[model samples]
Target: RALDRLIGTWRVSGGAEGTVSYRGLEGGHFLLQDIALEQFGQPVTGVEVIGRLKEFGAEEPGEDIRSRYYDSRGNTFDYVYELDGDTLTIWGGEKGSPAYYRATFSADGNTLSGAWVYPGGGGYDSVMTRVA
Candidate 1:
């Protein structure tokens, strides 16, 4: 399974060092993630849950995926994912708003590198090493 490739703990390094973990839950119907980092002199934590929006209907390979993210600062965002070979990109926005951020990852089974960016914020890059 595609999700199985991401099921492990990762240490991130680039602009900032952090930790992220992805796991399969609910009998593998869901992919859950926990992220922790020190941003702007404060501790930040986020939880993200992802699942398919539909089981059997899709215009393309990854169009039916949906996700929700909750952060410690009480912000929530909806997301969708696109998987292109070894690369996965997530597009996120408010429930009824246009997508404003994108996170992209290129994983070669064990090692991963990614970047995150928004409209005005400069992009942040990271290299993730799988720990398990």
Candidate 2:
């Protein structure tokens, strides 16, 4: 699967400080994201399931690569993912949203550098380094 490129643990820095881990679930149908991060001197954790938005037996995934997850604050966020080549784009809250993240992987796919930006230009740079 294309998502396999992100299967492993990565260290997150810059905008927020934390770690992210990705793994495949049964049958390799879904990629599970384990998030543990902190921002503004606080901690947050969440689990996200990444895969097709809708499923029909025997049918394959099309362009719908979406996910929703509940955070430690009981907040559920919806997002869509677009991975073209080594570039990764995630739309937060909704597609074409004001808040989003864009990052590109290194040549070896070990280092990902990018940033999370919000509307009105209040954002910061973020980098992810593979650890395992």
Candidate 3:
């Protein structure tokens, strides 16, 4: 029942603690995307160049989805998403770097919560309600 509702693209909105992409699928499937994280409290937006998620060994070959990041500021990054029910988490960095992030989403298909550990190590909790 819970997995059935996550079978499509979710329009992301509301955030400032670094942008990210989080895609989900049904039948034990998922895809992680790299969305732009802008500065100055602007909305987050960008293309998912490289991202990865745990693939269903029997159905698909490589994770459900993944993306490469290309910032408007002339930079790039790679990241992945991990899903556990309504709670989906993403983390990664440029090339060879450590992964860091702590995010969570609430049910009702609205209100995503989590944080991005920047500079080094740290975690926070935020919420993003569904828009589309």
Instruction: Work out the TM-score per prediction.
Output: 0.76, 0.88, 0.54
* Backbone clashes, each candidate: 0, 0, 10
lDDT of candidate 2 over 19-120, digit per residue (tens): 999999898878999999998999988999888755567466757688788789899988888888999988996668888889999999999898887978
| Top lDDT hit | 2
- The TM-score that candidate 3 achieves is 0.54
* Local error of candidate 1 at residue 94 (angstroms): 9.2
By TM-score, the better pick of 1 and 3 is 1
lDDT of 3 at 51: 30
Q: Positional deviation of 91 in candidate 2, in angstroms?
A: 0.8
lDDT by residue (tens digit), candidate 3, 1-132? 233333334444333545354555344434334455554676455655433343467564554334466655666666654566766655674322355455566656666666656564454445554544
Off by over 4 Å in 3: 1-38, 41-45, 49-60, 63-65, 93-98, 118-125
- lDDT score of residue 66 within candidate 1: 76
What shift in Å separates residue 20 of candidate 1 from its native position after superposition? 1.1
CA shift of 69, model 1, Å:
0.8
Q: What is the lDDT of residue 89 in candidate 3?
A: 52
